[PDB]
């Protein structure tokens, strides 16, 4: 029950962007991929969220249309796939085991990735 | 609404000793469903965010029984007794309101004495 993402992207602003996260050794179309965001010098803030079986997508109202996502069934893989970049997204970003949807438990978020360090 | 309580900061703290933290702000935080729903989480310098749940925390692996709580109302708790040298980590409690809103606790972590 694992999962792995892209290393860091460091380069000059602008230009189109993408980085993958890939779940495995678990049911990857069956728990959504959640979010989370944190620039340097500060605390947690919330992206958004995407379900792998069929793409239902409920981005966060601070970033919706200044971020696009996706997700792949047969590859166990899901990505940030933005149309450009900003000098705002310089972060280390984060995905997960998401939250609702487990006969219960709002939480969930129990199975997790390494990380990945977008920047301009 | 809003950054939610820290409650504590962060004070230089030595070794073995006691602390708690306080999942607190002006929403209701308990549907009519009847648990709590507060989200606790915490992590280390490293990265992986860590499993301390919606009950007011509450966990189901085997990250350390030095952390547990509970709670009612608006306002709820998660302890700390015997503050391990290792545990140099930030702790979180988390919002609900579906695919409104975009909060998380105020940055509590560990310093040392
Ligand atoms: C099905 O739904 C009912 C109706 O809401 C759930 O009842 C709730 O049960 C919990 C115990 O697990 C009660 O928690 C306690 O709340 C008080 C404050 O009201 C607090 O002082 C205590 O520390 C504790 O948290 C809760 O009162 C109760 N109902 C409501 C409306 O709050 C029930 O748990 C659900 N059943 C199952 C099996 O999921």
Same mark, same amino acid.
């Given at each position: 029950?694992? &999962?792995?993402?892209?290393?860091?992207?460091? =380069?000059?602003?602008?230009?189109?962007?993408?980085?993958?996260?890939?779940?495995?050794?678990?049911?990857?179309?069956? /728990?959504?991929?959640?979010?989370?965001?944190?620039?340097?010098?500060?605390?947690?803030?919330?992206?958004?969220?995407?379900?792998?079986?069929?793409?239902?997508?409920? /981005?966060?109202?601070?970033?919706?249309?200044?971020? *696009?996502?996706?997700?792949?069934? +047969?590859?166990?893989?899901? /990505?940030?796939?933005?149309? +450009?970049? =900003?000098?705002?997204?310089?972060?280390?970003?984060?995905?997960?085991?998401?939250?609702?949807?487990?006969?219960?438990?709002?939480?969930?978020?129990?199975?997790?990735?390494?990380?990945?360090?977008?920047?301009? | 609404?809003?950054?939610? %309580?820290?409650?504590? &900061?962060?004070?230089?703290?030595?070794?073995? #000793?006691?602390? +708690?933290?306080?999942?607190?702000? +002006?929403?209701?935080?308990?549907?009519?469903?009847?648990?709590? !729903? &507060?989200?606790? !989480?915490?992590? =280390?310098?490293?990265?992986?965010?860590?499993?301390?749940?919606?009950?007011?925390?509450?966990?189901?692996?085997?990250?350390?029984?030095?952390?547990?709580?509970?709670? *009612?109302? %608006?306002?709820?708790?998660?302890?700390?007794?015997?503050?391990?040298?290792?545990?140099?980590?930030? !702790? !979180?409690?988390?919002?609900?309101?579906?695919?409104?809103?975009?909060?998380?606790?105020?940055?509590?972590?560990? #310093?040392?004495?």
């Amino acid at each position: 029950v694992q &999962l792995v993402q892209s290393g860091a992207e460091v =380069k000059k602003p602008g230009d189109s962007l993408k980085i993958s996260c890939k779940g495995s050794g678990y049911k990857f179309a069956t /728990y959504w991929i959640g979010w989370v965001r944190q620039m340097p010098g500060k605390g947690l803030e919330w992206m958004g969220v995407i379900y792998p079986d069929d793409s239902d997508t409920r /981005y966060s109202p601070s970033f919706q249309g200044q971020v *696009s996502i996706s997700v792949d069934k +047969s590859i166990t893989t899901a /990505y940030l796939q933005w149309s +450009s970049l =900003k000098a705002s997204d310089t972060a280390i970003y984060y995905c997960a085991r998401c939250y609702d949807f487990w006969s219960g438990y709002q939480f969930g978020m129990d199975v997790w990735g390494q990380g990945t360090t977008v920047t301009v | 609404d809003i950054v939610m %309580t820290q409650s504590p &900061l962060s004070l230089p703290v030595t070794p073995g #000793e006691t602390a +708690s933290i306080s999942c607190r702000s +002006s929403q209701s935080l308990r549907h009519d469903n009847g648990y709590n !729903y &507060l989200d606790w !989480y915490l992590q =280390k310098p490293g990265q992986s965010p860590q499993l301390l749940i919606y009950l007011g925390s509450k966990r189901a692996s085997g990250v350390p029984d030095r952390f547990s709580g509970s709670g *009612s109302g %608006t306002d709820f708790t998660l302890k700390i007794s015997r503050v391990e040298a290792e545990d140099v980590g930030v !702790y !979180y409690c988390m919002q609900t309101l579906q695919t409104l809103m975009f909060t998380f606790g105020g940055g509590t972590k560990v #310093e040392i004495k």
